[PDB]
Amino acid sequence: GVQVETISPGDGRTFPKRGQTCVVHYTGMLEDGKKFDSSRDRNKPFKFMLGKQEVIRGWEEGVAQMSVGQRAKLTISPDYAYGATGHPGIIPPHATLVFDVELLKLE
């Protein structure tokens, strides 16, 4: 599944609802901290909606537990990410992923 560990607290009152646009900043890493991608590097947040298979399941379940302004680490098991296949030439088979995510706003 997914484990959420909070780095900085959110407002504790505004949680994402299916159908809302989530705006975030993320950094993706392997369990040893090796970085594979970051929206921060591109200077552009990533936007997605819950409930439309727009993101891997670990995000669908992890982001729903965050409130606006929260910064958290999401640890995602392989089945909730790229499973036994991985992602071609970036993520190996059976990898648990770690994402540092910040929920900037809901729109």
Added chain:
Amino acid sequence: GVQVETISPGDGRTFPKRGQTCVVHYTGMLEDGKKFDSSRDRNKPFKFMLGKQEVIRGWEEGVAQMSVGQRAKLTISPDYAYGATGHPGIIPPHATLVFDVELLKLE
């Protein structure tokens, strides 16, 4: 993992080696037989190589057990396919997939 059930036998001697081009015909279905895709419908075989993350793991492990001319049903568990996410708007979360595959030739 993956289960291979043979419909028509292969030559029993030519098995795919990593680095070879596999040429196949396939039909993808859910466990109840509902078809989601088929190369047969397009009149064009599908070509891929083992060992390059070009296909879901259930195929990487299942096709390697087939010999040229064999026709088999591959039953693939979710982690060896699209896991808890599925494939956007085609395959639901946690689905076991069934592929009817025919190994036409190796090149």
